[PDB]
Amino acid sequence: SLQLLNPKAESLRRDAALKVNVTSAEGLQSVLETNLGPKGTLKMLVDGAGNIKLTKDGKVLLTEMQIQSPTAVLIARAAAAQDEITGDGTTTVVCLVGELLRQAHRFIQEGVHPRIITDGFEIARKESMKFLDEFKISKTNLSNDREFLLQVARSSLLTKVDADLTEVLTPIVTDAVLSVYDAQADNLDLHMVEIMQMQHLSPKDTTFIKGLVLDHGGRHPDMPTRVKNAYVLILNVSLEYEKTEVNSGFFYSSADQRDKLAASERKFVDAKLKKIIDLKNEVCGMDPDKGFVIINQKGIDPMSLDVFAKHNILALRRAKRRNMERLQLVTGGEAQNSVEDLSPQILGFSGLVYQETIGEEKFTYVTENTDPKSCTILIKGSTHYALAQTKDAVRDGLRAVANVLKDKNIIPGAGAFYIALSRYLRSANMNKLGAKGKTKTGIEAFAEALLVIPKTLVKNSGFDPLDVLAMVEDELDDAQDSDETRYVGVDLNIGDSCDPTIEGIWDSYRVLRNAITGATGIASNLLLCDELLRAGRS
Amino acid sequence: SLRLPQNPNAGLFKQGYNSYSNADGQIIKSIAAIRELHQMCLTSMGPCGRNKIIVNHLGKIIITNDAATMLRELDIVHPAVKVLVMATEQQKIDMGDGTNLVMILAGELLNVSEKLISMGLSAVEIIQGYNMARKFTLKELDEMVVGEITDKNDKNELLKMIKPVISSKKYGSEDILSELVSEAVSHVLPVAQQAGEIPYFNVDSIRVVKIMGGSLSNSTVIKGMVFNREPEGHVKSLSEDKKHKVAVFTCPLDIANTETKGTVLLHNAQEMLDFSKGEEKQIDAMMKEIADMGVECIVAGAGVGELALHYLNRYGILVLKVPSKFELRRLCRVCGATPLPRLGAPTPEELGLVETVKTMEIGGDRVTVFKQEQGEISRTSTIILRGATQNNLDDIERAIDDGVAAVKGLMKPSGGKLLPGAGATEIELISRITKYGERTPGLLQLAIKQFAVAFEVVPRTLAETAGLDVNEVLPNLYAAHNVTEPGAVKTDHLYKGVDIDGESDEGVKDIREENIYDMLATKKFAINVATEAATTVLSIDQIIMAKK
Amino acid sequence: SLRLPQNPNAGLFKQGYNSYSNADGQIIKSIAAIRELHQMCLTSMGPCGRNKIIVNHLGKIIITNDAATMLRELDIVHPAVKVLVMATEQQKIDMGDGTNLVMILAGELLNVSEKLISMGLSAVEIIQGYNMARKFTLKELDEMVVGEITDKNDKNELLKMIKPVISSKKYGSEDILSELVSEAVSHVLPVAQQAGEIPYFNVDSIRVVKIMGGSLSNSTVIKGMVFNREPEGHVKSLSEDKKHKVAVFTCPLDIANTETKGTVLLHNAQEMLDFSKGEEKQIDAMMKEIADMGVECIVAGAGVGELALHYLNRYGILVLKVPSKFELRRLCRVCGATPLPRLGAPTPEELGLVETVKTMEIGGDRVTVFKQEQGEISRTSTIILRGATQNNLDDIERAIDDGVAAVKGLMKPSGGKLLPGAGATEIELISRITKYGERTPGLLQLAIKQFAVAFEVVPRTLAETAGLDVNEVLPNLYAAHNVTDHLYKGVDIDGESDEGVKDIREENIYDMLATKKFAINVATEAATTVLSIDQIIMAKK
Ligand SMILES: Nc1ncnc2c1ncn2[C@@H]1O[C@H](COP(=O)(O)OP(=O)(O)O)[C@@H](O)[C@H]1O
Ligand SMILES: Nc1ncnc2c1ncn2[C@@H]1O[C@H](COP(=O)(O)OP(=O)(O)O)[C@@H](O)[C@H]1O
Ligand SMILES: Nc1ncnc2c1ncn2[C@@H]1O[C@H](COP(=O)(O)OP(=O)(O)O)[C@@H](O)[C@H]1O
Ligand SMILES: [Mg+2]
Ligand SMILES: [Mg+2]
Ligand SMILES: [Mg+2]
């Protein structure tokens, strides 16, 4: 039908479209199968430029390696979109769609329709949402348990990096997250927590700074390096020259009038500097002990830097949009734009301001605040890929622990959620459900597909995956009759079951919810498609 | 049968992308890929090390014995080898000392790891083995330390510091090269004894200007600095004592033109007559306030006009060009002047002090000198380095950067904390780490054992490059440490090391009287970054590339 | 999302193999594609049909409005068409009549079955439907016979036989060509009071000698044959001897040489002198015996030597080569002699009789005519065709081959009874099958009805070539069958065809029973194969 219409085209239908979606799914699954879990293998990505970037995140692997298949680009958007808002569960979405297609394809070969199979996944998904309410556990945030946040931070950090980096980088996240909770209980991740690159001694020397760190310092030598008590000032006004909207020549007639008009360039700048001097006169007391610093969002003229250097005022220019939205949280002051209306109330407070330089670059450190509402995480590293590995680790770790404070619940992991849904879907009475007909295998297909995830953790350790679930099955058979509510786990060190409640392995709530919802939608849409084709003008 | 299916489901990725897993002996190949350029580093460590020719696509050649420097120009395909390039680049930037070691140690840790992975040790246990060895290695470096400097400025102490550093890069003669650095270090340091002030030192203070011709013995130590400039108006020997004054201006010595459309406007002939003379009288009037302060040389930051030049050389004011930012900032540190962009009167407190400004022929071209005297000392001194081949000037200049980088190692920590060199610091850790393997149980003992075997490359390399048979020189040196510490105190078997030239057998007559030592701060970060180089290469089990 | 994964069964069968299975749409692709060649045989159908010029790769041009001759030369890449090609060739080699109905009825069953497959009826049931409908068609044709012939000897009785066949191909020539074919069959058949027990007849009895030039009316019948050959030696007497004994030798007239090669050996000059006369006296001993019995004509298949030709010239014996072996035995059937590879001597029992042999030019070229009067002949005849172009005479030969092939189709079986033609029995079968479909309830009733609709093309194809409206004469013809007289209703082809009714007996248009039965069977078997296949596997080039 397509060859007589289009003189050139490609068409697959009714057996190859199903084999393509399953073969491409099994192919992409094998790539990210080994990365899943704590003992998984690392993966570097080097392009033709020659740069190196190292991480285990499936999003970085998918959004850097170009892919030609039409199925995998939907898995790429699904794995990326789930991680872009949640920050965790990337490879879990690929494994579910990677496993649910092959687990249903065996029954498509038997002759079951794709429509009624996907109808079983949807009604089975509603059972999992009802199971999340009973499976989760309530946790009160008023206790302010720091040990509970430490265990959540080690869940994601142990997966990416080893124990040496996890132990030193875990309390860096906990100290940053401990300040997030407040009376308003409004979560703020992007403005409050930041990441900055700095090539320094080693990755292990990452330290926590309570104040806002800046990537610039004092240009002039005579300007002060260290300041004990520095009251900041925010000004978004540009203090260099301005070209003035079509204004043209300073038509000068005589030679004396030439430089007389050139001196007017300083008058516009000096009109704004005098307001700073008038502000300094109000806070002139204890001038050797105290200090003053000005932070500008736009550039400052080098002619005006000597004015600040004479009065021992520290100058910082060309700040980011985000840093201006963070000085009020750290120093406690208020922002200002125009130099007309000033007051001492808007000035912040800082207990220690010092600068340290390496090579050509220079960094400014601010800390020792009275009541800092925000902070930073200055990560140290050796190579560029070391920063990229710490970028993805801190980016995925902050989002995972931040979601625990959003809600009042937390899901235990280590296969407890998948193993619990297996017994629930395989033992629940079907008469309570509304599905009938050939929906018998759809419940078994999706229930059995969840088992492949916790044994993929075992496949990286090298043990037999089927044998380490024998005692797990025998434990739950007696746990229901023993009248003791416990949740089992999968410990890869010894190859035996464990309890995530005491070991500290946990997982966020919206990760597993959005993962199955996004995976079931993608896997269902790929099953119903029975024809592939390419056509268009080019 | 005639053709395979050629890897089905390969259209998931592009045709140019390739995967490289741990299987198929590819981790052995990555160790072999390190072994290609690692053997190039064998003949470049030590005082008998051989330099390397590197011809770039542009044709710029640099001849050198230093790892971090040679690896910058070579375009590398293997990513695991690039870890060593950036690891040595980190070594050069931070400490500026011990880059071959980063290369020769981390390459040998991958060499002995070739035996461990072949035996069947898991990669996770290998990282735990070297980390536990690293904590014990850095601990024992602080224990077996002997000696300290305790004085920032001394003639004899600096010979113990600079001489073992520059002995690797362009050894040559010892005294003529060491005295140029020890004399220049004393000039720039703020001594200030019995004051309690914090010391301070900058790597950018000491800078070497390359001048062709002459010989290495004719090199002198200049108090000030030098450029290859020409005075515009006139040259002056300046035989007048009673020191001159210095005024630095960052703006050009000309009329400050309007930034927005500076154009003449003359409505009548009365303005036409006075406009030509007005510029002359205006420029002259600005020079009166400058000339009355007693200044005789002004350093300009950009192009100077001819009318301003006519009034400067009238009173004999020298003009100097510095058309860049850093070239103008380095000169203010010598005389201690504070520049101001205005064309007004320099402040008397801000005027600099320079006694003489000579112009002589060194390399056939015109150069201007700013030698100070013993009174009113200055900082940011230079070293006139004379040589025949421009390629040798480049490597000797970076040897001063390594020596100046070694002086930085004294400021931050509490003191010097020197160690015995000539392989003595490496061979001592072999016995201590070997004993540590016997104390710990578990399957990690083989990782601790092979970590000690990797440290044999320093004495094995120095014995191979010295033209001696390593099979006889190495076990002869083990006899000094197999006779371990008896009941008598003050044992002197720690200073035994290899020898490049001389007596048979080789245990050197101590590294003592020889006055060669190593820095603690270099060994700390070198073993740290070398272990990180082996950690990142051994921890990864799959590699993915593109386009090749 | 740029390059596909390329169908990962590409490790299986090579790129040259193409699969065109069903569900994908094979049936829709095939039934349609073949509608182009279906219109070729449809336009070339009937007495007013259009002949089609087919130029093969060698360049030999042909112009024939049949179907077997056309499709033999057409290099057709489509495999489903080729089932119809050699199925039509089976009709050519066996019966020699009905190539066109087959290409038309076989294609129309696939065209009319579009409704069955599109509605969703099972393909297996359609094969069972046409098979049971085929059995009812064969049983029902016997009852509609009114032409039970038992004489099959006289010439006027063949006017109901040969003239409908000749009227199809080049309708303008009926009486002339029928006189040639009918007079040829009378010479072929022997004179006897009652010849029975299935007398033998073959297509090689009546041959066709094509002569360039001359109008078709100037043709004539020759009992012998005519060869484009040059006689040698003398001119004939043409009335003097009154009869001529003709010996046919397979081997040439020469000294008997062995298969193994030899040469002349002479030990002395005495044998050299006698060798010149020895060869002359050797043939003279064998040639003089032939002339004693009066053999006035010798035919040697291989090349005749000059020494043997010289002795025959003085006695006045006719010589002839006849190099081809197939046409050598046909001359023996005329005279009534046997081949003789041995030289031997002529015997009276093995030697035949020939009245006279005369030489002239018919179309400018000198030829040898073996016409004889008052002689006994057995299974031999020829038709001398005169025409303006060689391209037209080629179609007259195949028309005569189809005419005499019908004589083979009559006399070989026990009965070759007639049927009403001109769109008379085809519309009757539509009424019979329409009533048969209601007798058997079931899902196969739809196949029985659509099998009857496929027979509609036979009347309207005569109307389409006649420039008449199909929607007027075809439904008007059904009203004539309402009710013997209703059986002899047919399609008229004339300017007065507005009524659409013409009696069959006025012009005596008839068709054969065995020809239509074999055509319906091969047509149903052709449609059975095309509807039974689902997958078609090609290959490279
Ligand atoms: N140390 C551990 N012990 C047991 N299970 C773990 C451990 N670390 C991670 N997991 C499990 O691995 C799964 C994936 O973790 P994570 O890397 O955060 O998500 P993703 O692999 O989708 O990016 C989680 O379900 C978690 O329970
Ligand atoms: N003359 C000498 N005798 C004995 N040992 C020496 C001598 N010169 C250098 N060495 C040893 O050779 C080693 C070479 O160190 P190397 O890595 O080349 O230093 P650098 O970092 O300056 O390149 C030193 O650690 C030192 O102990
Ligand atoms: N003068 C005529 N009047 C009516 N019908 C005619 C006339 N001449 C020929 N026909 C019809 O034209 C048809 C041509 O059939 P044809 O395809 O030649 O038969 P076959 O397929 O057996 O070779 C015949 O069935 C015959 O009935
Ligand atoms: Mg994760
Ligand atoms: Mg050194
Ligand atoms: Mg016919």
Return the beta strands (E) in A330-388 as ranges: 352-358, 361-367, 376-378
Query: Could you tell me the two tokens for A234?
Result: 């925010």
A46 CA distance to ligand 4 middle (Å): 23
- A249 has a chain B CB within 8 A of its CB: yes
Task: Dihedral sign for Cα C275, C276, C278, C282, please.
Answer: positive
- Flag if B8 and C8 touch (Cβ within 8 Å): yes
Experimental technique behind these coordinates? cryo-EM
Whether A450 and A431 share a structural domain: yes
Query: Could you tell me the two tokens for C410?
Result: 């009559």
Q: Which of B19, B536, B539 is the best mutation test for A, with the most CBs of A within 10 A?
A: B536
Q: What are phi and psi of C271, to 5 degrees?
A: -75, -25
Cross-strand bridge partners of residue C499: none
Q: Is B395 helix (H, G, I), strand (E, B) or coil?
A: helix
What's the alpha-carbon Rg for chain C, to the nearest Å? Answer: 30
Contact B210, B390 (CB under 8 A): yes
C45 CA distance to ligand 3 middle (Å): 8
- A532 has a chain C CB within 8 A of its CB: yes
Measured between alpha carbons, how far apart are the two ends of chain B, in Å? 29
Of C413, C433, C494, give the one whose Cα is nearest residue C198. C413
Whether A193 and A280 share a structural domain: no
In CATH, which superfamily holds the domain spanning B226-412? GroEL (3.50.7.10)
Query: Could you tell me the two tokens for B363?
Result: 């390399």
CA-to-CA dists, residue C475 to B129, C47, C381, C469, angstroms:
101, 22, 47, 11
B65 CA distance to ligand 2 middle (Å): 12
Whether A283 and A172 share a structural domain: no
Say how many residues make up chain B: 548
Chains touching A by CB (3 or more pairs below 8 Å): B, C
Task: Dihedral sign for Cα B401, B402, B403, B405, please.
Answer: positive
- Flag if B9 and C8 touch (Cβ within 8 Å): yes
Q: Which residue of A has its CA nearest to C33?
A: A4
Q: Is C414 helix (H, G, I), strand (E, B) or coil?
A: coil
Contact A55, A388 (CB under 8 A): yes
What is the C-alpha separation between C394 and C61, in angstroms, rounded?
10
C165 CA distance to ligand 6 middle (Å): 5
- Flag if B90 and A45 touch (Cβ within 8 Å): no
The count of CB pairs under 8 A between chains A and B is 149
Gap from B373 CA to chain A (nearest CA, Å): 25
What is the C-alpha separation between A110 and A93, in angstroms, rounded?
26
Contact B318, B358 (CB under 8 A): no
Task: Dihedral sign for Cα A369, A371, A374, A379, please.
Answer: positive
Atom of ligand 1 nearest to the CA of A89: 22
Q: Which residues line ligand 1 (CB under 6 A)?
A: A 36-38, 88-92, 155-156, 158-159, 413-414, 490, 505, 507
| Residue B295, phi-psi category: left (phi > 0), alpha (psi -120 to 50), beta (remainder) | beta
A37 CA distance to ligand 4 middle (Å): 9
| CB within 8 Å of C81: residues ≥ 6 apart | C34, C37
CB-ligand 3 contact for C100 (6 Å cutoff): yes
Of C491, C469, C507, give the one whose Cα is nearest residue C425. C491
Whether A353 and A398 share a structural domain: no
Q: Which residues of B touch A254 (CB under 8 A)?
A: 271, 274-275, 278
Identify which ligand lies nearest to the alpha carbon of C165. Answer: 6
Contact B468, B498 (CB under 8 A): no
Return the beta strands (E) in B402-533 as ranges: 418-420, 517-519
Whether A362 and A215 share a structural domain: yes
Measured between alpha carbons, how far apart are the two ends of chain A, in Å? 21
Residue labelled with tokens 């390459």: B107
Orientation angle between helical segments B424-439 and B123-143, nearest 10 degrees: 120
| CB within 8 Å of C480: residues ≥ 6 apart | C486, C489, C500, C501
Q: Is C207 helix (H, G, I), strand (E, B) or coil?
A: strand
CB-ligand 3 contact for C47 (6 Å cutoff): yes
Amino acid in position B484 = T
| CB within 8 Å of B439: residues ≥ 6 apart | none
CA-to-CA dists, residue C15 to A416, B67, C18, C538, angstroms:
50, 55, 7, 10
Question: Reported resolution in A?
Answer: 3.0
Q: Which residues of A touch C5 (CB under 8 A)?
A: 20, 23-24, 68-69
Of A56, A66, A65, A63, give the one whose Cα is nearest residue A78. A63
- Flag if C8 and A14 touch (Cβ within 8 Å): no
What is the C-alpha separation between A130 and A132, in angstroms, rounded?
6
CA diameter of chain C: 104
Whether A52 and A156 share a structural domain: no
Say how many residues make up chain C: 541
Gap from B541 CA to chain C (nearest CA, Å): 28
Gap from C11 CA to chain B (nearest CA, Å): 5
Query: Could you tell me the two tokens for B422?
Result: 């000539």
The enclosing H or E element of A138 equals: strand A137-138
Contact C147, C419 (CB under 8 A): yes
Contact C133, C451 (CB under 8 A): yes
Q: Which residues of B touch A225 (CB under 8 A)?
A: none
CA-to-CA dists, residue C459 to C410, C456, C486, C489, C496, angstroms:
26, 6, 16, 11, 17
- A4 has a chain B CB within 8 A of its CB: no
Residue labelled with tokens 């009376």: A183
CB atoms within 10 A of CB C432: 17
Contact A163, B128 (CB under 8 A): no
Cross-strand bridge partners of residue C300: C249
Helix%, strand%, coil% for chain A, nearest 5: 50, 15, 40
Atom of ligand 1 nearest to the CA of A159: 8
Q: DSSP class of residue A141?
A: G
Q: What are phi and psi of A292, to 5 degrees?
A: -150, 140
Whether A226 and A352 share a structural domain: yes
Q: Is A348 helix (H, G, I), strand (E, B) or coil?
A: coil
What is the C-alpha separation between B445 and B130, in angstroms, rounded?
10
Contact A509, A136 (CB under 8 A): yes
Task: Dihedral sign for Cα C93, C97, C103, C109, please.
Answer: negative
Of C187, C178, C91, give the one whose Cα is nearest residue C405. C91
Alpha-helix residue ranges (DSSP H) falling in B353-455: 390-408, 424-439, 445-453
Cross-strand bridge partners of residue C297: C246, C318
**Nearest residue, CB atoms, A16 vs list C3, C7, C25:** C7
Q: How many domains does chain A have?
A: 3
**DSSP code string of A202-246:** -GGG-EEESS--BS---SSSSS-S-BSEEE--EE---BS----TT
Q: Is C299 helix (H, G, I), strand (E, B) or coil?
A: strand
Say how many residues make up chain A: 538
Burial level of B67, CB count in 10 A (0-12/13-18/19+)? buried
Cross-strand bridge partners of residue C210: C385
Contact C160, C508 (CB under 8 A): yes
Query: Could you tell me the two tokens for A88?
Result: 């965790």
Q: Which residues of C touch A16 (CB under 8 A)?
A: 7-9
What is the C-alpha separation between C53 and C36, in angstroms, rounded?
16
Chains touching C by CB (3 or more pairs below 8 Å): A, B
Out of B167, B498, B513, give the residue to mutate to test ligand 2, the one with the largest number of ligand atoms within 8 Å of its CB.
Answer: B167
Q: What are phi and psi of C244, to 5 degrees?
A: -135, 125
Q: Is C84 helix (H, G, I), strand (E, B) or coil?
A: helix
**Nearest residue, CB atoms, B265 vs list A243, A251, A265:** A251
Task: Dihedral sign for Cα A386, A389, A391, A397, please.
Answer: negative
Whether A385 and A446 share a structural domain: no
CA-to-CA dists, residue C41 to B310, C49, C469, angstroms:
111, 9, 20
**Nearest residue, CB atoms, A534 vs list C4, C24, C25:** C4
What's the alpha-carbon Rg for chain A, to the nearest Å? Answer: 30
Orientation angle between helical segments A70-86 and A90-110, nearest 10 degrees: 140
| Cα A430 versus chain centre, distance | 41
Gap from C74 CA to chain B (nearest CA, Å): 36
CB atoms within 10 A of CB B62: 19
C163 CA distance to ligand 3 middle (Å): 10
CB-ligand 2 contact for B98 (6 Å cutoff): yes
CA-to-CA dists, residue C254 to A503, C305, C309, C312, C332, angstroms:
119, 6, 10, 12, 21
**Nearest residue, CB atoms, A13 vs list C2, C4, C24:** C24
Q: What residues make up the domain containing A254?
A: 211-372
What is the C-alpha separation between B258 and B274, in angstroms, rounded?
20
- Flag if A69 and C1 touch (Cβ within 8 Å): yes
Q: What are phi and psi of A45, to 5 degrees?
A: -135, 115
What is the C-alpha separation between B337 and C120, in angstroms, rounded?
102
CB-ligand 3 contact for C511 (6 Å cutoff): yes
Of B474, B465, B484, B455, give the one whose Cα is nearest residue B136. B455
| CB within 8 Å of B472: residues ≥ 6 apart | none
How many helices and strands in chain C, by DSSP H and E? Answer: 18, 15
Amino acid in position C309 = L
CB atoms within 10 A of CB A242: 10
Return the beta strands (E) in A382-536 as ranges: 409-410, 489-491, 496-498, 531-534
Q: How many CA atoms lie within 13 A of C202 on its CB side?
A: 6
| CB within 8 Å of C252: residues ≥ 6 apart | C300, C301, C302, C303, C304, C305, C308
Contact B79, B33 (CB under 8 A): no
Residue labelled with tokens 């002689």: C375
Q: Which residue of B has its CA nearest to A20?
A: B9
CB-ligand 2 contact for B46 (6 Å cutoff): yes
Q: Which residues of B touch A46 (CB under 8 A)?
A: 79, 544-546
Cross-strand bridge partners of residue A531: A13
Measured between alpha carbons, how far apart are the two ends of chain C, in Å? 33
- Flag if C23 and A14 touch (Cβ within 8 Å): yes
| CB within 8 Å of B50: residues ≥ 6 apart | B43, B44, B65, B465
Identify which ligand lies nearest to the alpha carbon of B69. Answer: 2
| A217-241 per-residue burial string, b: 16 or more CB within 10 A, e: under 16 | bbebeebbeebeebbbbbbeeebee
Q: How many CA atoms lie within 13 A of B29 on its CB side?
A: 12
DSSP strand pairing (B542-545 vs A43-46) = parallel
Cross-strand bridge partners of residue B518: B419
A32 CA distance to ligand 4 middle (Å): 13
Cross-strand bridge partners of residue A322: none
Q: Is A159 helix (H, G, I), strand (E, B) or coil?
A: helix
- Flag if A250 and B544 touch (Cβ within 8 Å): no
Order the strands of the B318-321 sheet from edge to edge: B318-321, B295-300, B244-248, B352-354
Chains touching B by CB (3 or more pairs below 8 Å): A, C
Identify which ligand lies nearest to the alpha carbon of C402. Answer: 6
Q: What are phi and psi of C62, to 5 degrees?
A: -135, 150
What is the C-alpha separation between C176 and C179, in angstroms, rounded?
5
Contact A499, A510 (CB under 8 A): no
CB atoms within 10 A of CB A247: 10
| CB within 8 Å of B258: residues ≥ 6 apart | A249, A250, A252, A258, A261, A262
| CB within 8 Å of A371: residues ≥ 6 apart | A332
| Residue B261, phi-psi category: left (phi > 0), alpha (psi -120 to 50), beta (remainder) | left
Query: Could you tell me the two tokens for C473?
Result: 């004469």
| C126-156 per-residue burial string, b: 16 or more CB within 10 A, e: under 16 | bbebbebbbebbeeebeeeeebeeeebeeee
What is the C-alpha separation between B323 and B320, in angstroms, rounded?
10
